[PDB]
Design a binder for this molecule. Structure first.
Ligand SMILES: *Cc1c(COP(=O)(O)O)cnc(C)c1O
Ligand SMILES: *Cc1c(COP(=O)(O)O)cnc(C)c1O
Lengths: 359, 358
């Protein structure tokens, strides 16, 4: 049998890259594949995409696994290097690197590398997470232009904190700061990720960094899916029923007796739980497809099972196909229901689920 | 240097035996399903050669144990999902639960080189898996007539509200489990972590410690493992990748969600929900930077968490961070975030590096 499994549609990956090239026609693409490619598989997502102009990661650990798998494209270390000793590996492997502190800068100033590196000076434009603050960037930037160990020109990168909230002037204030600093300077400019791409065409610049939207899921703080932008659900979280049992009115199902039935019915048990990555927070009523027909979750979601209400004479039975989200059921619909972010839903999965790749 | 789960092997064996002291007349089924609750399926098994069996959710998982060289009986807590799977289960000497018609009919007509040991799963109130009572003495009788089943047929069940001693769920559930097992040979087992600690009349022949085995309390009452003499096994650790200046009135994070009322210094941790850390963590949650507790400030993110260090603080990129672990029980983090400790330690991704000490 099949319990739990993530089916990855390679043909949809393929298409949202293109579809994103159509939305940001004058910008190069940095396919963001950090965190095991948002739960879709780091190496397999990269291999699905010989077209990305580059690949973005969080950590080096992650870039090095690309290389190990045979991926040859430029890989962008979005957060940089964490230790000055990895700078020889960086230049060897031809990684590009963000530089946000004076430890990473100082480390490039002094290191003796065989080849210079390509760098992006992270500028803090309003997120206040990583990056050099404005009042500090002009001097930091100038030191990078004088490194013989950095490739000229120095590129400039930044990130939006609230691009999915078009009504607050957040984004437009970051853009103002970004534009002021990049005035008169060569080399290139990122600042846009999924939101900036979809919603702010004035912050496409030279390179855009699609992450969540790449996978056909939406960045947005509302009920838009990837299909709202012509982008196609990459992932399908699937499993199977391992039991179909009789149940009676007034009887609770499961831990804490969270749900009590008002009628005699039949309950289905799914080989899926939080030990696989399915949200334990999922409330009774959350939709799940059993044989393609929606049924509600009844009870607490356990570590490796989920109960659903099939009906008093349903004909489903152990072994039948279950879809937690995918074709027929977006992850955005499971996010609105659960109250969990689609970003977390597709990404915080464990190693217990099998990975399948299709097309 | 970064996201890492440190597993204390010493605390793990302290707990198994702590638990044999609490349930002195019962044999131990070390529950290691879901990658041993975060901790590592096979390495948790190899740390406990002593325990009397291992429990898993799926057959996949049992097979992975045999592949690593583990040889204690393994108990398939949910049984087998396909009949073509009886032959493997028989040869590999996996013990199984039997809760439905399909599984029983499979046992009835398989041909097998050896008989398989079985635990009939009885639904005593949880209404999740198991044969209902009106229906169980037949189910039962058919299993004792299998020559494919090693006699006697054992009986297993599970509590749905053992952590709520004030409601009569458990004692309703035990009443049923006891009426059915009247007069029948073969082992009995119904207790997991909660039943073991709060209900000694429920220990019977075998108890199945799961969460407590890892030194974490199963009650959402604010107690720890230590509260039962059990030592925490897991420490979710990482490092700071930046220490930056920040000013009063400035926000931080997705949705500028925390705004500072002072000039301070923020630390950035190489930890996010892409690692398994709850995105739901509110500003406030405790982190330990440099063995000193600091609050999370801002939304948590795929790969970085910001903390408030202080205007003048001398923490430095590179420095050690503990999400939970020694200075910081996972139960404290569960109270501050409203997640279950069960989910916190288990729903981690594959990006966590695993360390084993002692
Ligand atoms: C992860 C990340 C991205 C992608 O963002 P999405 O909203 O998922 O598209 C782009 N850039 C940086 C700096 C990131 O850390
Ligand atoms: C997983 C499980 C356990 C162990 O539960 P804890 O609450 O962690 O003690 C024991 N028995 C069964 C039937 C289970 O599914």
């Amino acid at each position: 049998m099949q319990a739990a499994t993530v089916v990855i549609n390679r043909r949809a990956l393929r298409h949202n890259l293109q579809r994103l090239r159509e939305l940001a026609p004058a910008s190069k693409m940095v396919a963001v594949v950090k965190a095991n490619a948002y739960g879709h598989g780091l190496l397999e997502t990269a291999r699905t995409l010989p077209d990305a102009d580059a690949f973005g990661v969080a950590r080096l650990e992650e870039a090095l696994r690309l290389r190990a798998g045979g991926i040859t494209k430029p890989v962008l270390l979005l957060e940089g290097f964490f230790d000055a000793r990895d700078l020889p590996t960086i230049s060897a492997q031809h990684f590009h690197t963000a530089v946000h502190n004076e430890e990473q800068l100082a480390a490039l100033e002094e290191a003796s590398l065989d080849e210079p590196v390509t760098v992006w000076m992270k500028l803090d434009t309003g997120m206040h997470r990583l990056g050099v603050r404005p009042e500090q960037a002009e001097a930091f930037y100038h030191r990078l232009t004088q490194c013989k160990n950095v490739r000229q020109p120095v590129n400039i990168v930044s990130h939006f904190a609230r691009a999915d909230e078009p009504k607050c002037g957040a984004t437009e204030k970051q853009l103002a700061i970004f534009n002021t600093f990049c005035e008169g300077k060569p080399g290139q400019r990122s600042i846009a990720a999924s939101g900036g791409i979809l919603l702010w065409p004035q912050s496409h610049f030279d390179w855009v960094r699609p992450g969540i939207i790449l996978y056909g899921v939406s960045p947005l703080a509302d009920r838009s899916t990837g299909a709202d932008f012509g982008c196609q659900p990459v992932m399908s979280l699937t499993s199977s029923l391992i039991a179909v049992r009789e149940h009676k009115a007034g009887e609770p199902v499961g831990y804490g007796g969270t749900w009590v039935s008002e009628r005699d019915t039949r309950l289905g048990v799914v080989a899926m739980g939080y030990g696989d990555g399915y949200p334990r927070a999922a409330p009774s009523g959350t939709p799940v497809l059993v044989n393609g027909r929606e049924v509600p979750i009844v009870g607490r979601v356990a570590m490796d099972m989920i109960c659903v209400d099939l009906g008093p004479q349903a004909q489903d039975k152990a072994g039948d196909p279950v879809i937690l989200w995918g074709e027929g059921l977006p992850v955005e619909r499971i996010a609105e229901m659960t109250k969990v972010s689609a970003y977390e839903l597709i990404t915080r999965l464990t190693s217990r689920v099998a990975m399948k790749y299709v097309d």
